[PDB]
Amino acid sequence: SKEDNDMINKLNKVFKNKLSNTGNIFVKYSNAYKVNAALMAAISIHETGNGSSSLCKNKNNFFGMKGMSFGSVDEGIKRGISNLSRNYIHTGRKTLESIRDKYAPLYDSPLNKDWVPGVGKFYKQITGNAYSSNSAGTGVGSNEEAEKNLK
């Protein structure tokens, strides 16, 4: 909780625009889904131009999840962390390279070569530290397992 409050403050220091003051949402769902809150925050910043994208503003889509929209900021951030936990980090995608290979494959789109550097830059801007894949988290297999962790 002192650990959580410090991570919440570090997130909210970097978050701008529609990401502002959402540090507590990132930390809440990163804990329940057993993943790195600063990594979740770094991917959101990259995908949204730090909460400035129309996709982020109009569709509460904080993770560049193509052609999706969400009913609230909470649920949009939550859905993005759930997807990254269940379908990436829990399946064993721990490195920025192995996450990118699935998340933003190199030749699908020219912006995709900016993903590993972009996410890396923001992760170091949040924590003071270069991202280590040992930090990724275990992730969880299901929303049901995440819900059990919240209780």
- Identify the CA nearest to 34 among candidates 106, 151, 136, 144: 136
> What distance in Å separates the CA atoms of residue 29 and residue 33, rounded to the nearest whole number?
6
How far is residue 60 CA from its own chain's centroid? Answer: 14
CA distance 105 to 97: 10
Specify whether the CB–CB gap between 97 and 116 falls below 8 A: yes
Neighbours of 91 (CB within 10 A): 13
Give the burial class of 125: count Cβ atoms within 10 A of its Cβ; 0-12 exposed, 13-18 middle, 19 or more buried: middle
| Domain range enclosing 60 | 2-150
CATH code of the domain containing 108: 1.10.530.10
Other CB atoms within 10 Å distance of the CB of residue 90: 20
Contact (Cβ atoms closer than 8 angstroms) between residue 122 and residue 46: yes
Q: How far apart are CA 118 and CA 99, in angstroms?
A: 13
Q: Residues 26, 80: contact at Cβ < 8 Å?
A: no
Please state the domain count of the chain: 1
E strands, 14-101, where? Answer: none
Confirm if 141 and 49 have CB atoms less than 8 A apart: no
